[PDB]
Design a protein around this ligand. Structure first.
Ligand SMILES: O=C1CCCN1c1cccc(NS(=O)(=O)c2c(F)cccc2F)c1
Length: 127
């Protein structure tokens, strides 16, 4: 029932790049999902205490959220686009694992994920 430390957003010895695909992931993908009416539950790590989800981090062992993704993008934490795309997919998948079909939060994730997929479809070719 306690919260873990959030996912890493800073790690100086981790190799980093800024690529045109990673720029797109910030300026288009993250920006698009962040402004959405259903973004707010996903804008920070799940607070299992405040939300009264004592089992959450006993079930979800790779937590992820857009707050974390936003910091990772702003701090140029990634090596490539795939790492960032994986974080979004982890966020959506966690929601679907933990909750049940038709739950409000699942409907919210589904709407964000639809947009996510539309934007990743238009991912620019590298460099
Ligand atoms: O699974 C996830 C990922 C992001 C938040 N989340 C989740 C799952 C279950 C309950 C809550 N608690 S909440 O934020 O107050 C909330 C509700 F209680 C009902 C509908 C939407 C909500 F956001 C949050």
């Amino acid at each position: 029932s306690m919260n873990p430390p959030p996912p890493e957003t800073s790690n100086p010895n981790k190799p980093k790049r800024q690529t045109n695909q990673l720029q797109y992931l910030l300026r288009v993908v993250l920006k698009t999902l962040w402004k959405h009416q259903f973004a707010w539950p996903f804008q920070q790590p799940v607070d299992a205490v405040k939300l009264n989800l004592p089992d959450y981090y006993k079930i979800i062992k790779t937590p992820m959220d857009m707050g974390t993704i936003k910091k990772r993008l702003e701090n140029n934490y990634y090596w490539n686009a795939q790492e960032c795309i994986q974080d979004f997919n982890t966020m959506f998948t966690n929601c679907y694992i933990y909750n049940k079909p038709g739950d409000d939060i699942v409907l919210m994730a589904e709407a964000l994920e639809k947009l996510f997929l539309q934007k990743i479809n238009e991912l620019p070719t590298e460099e």
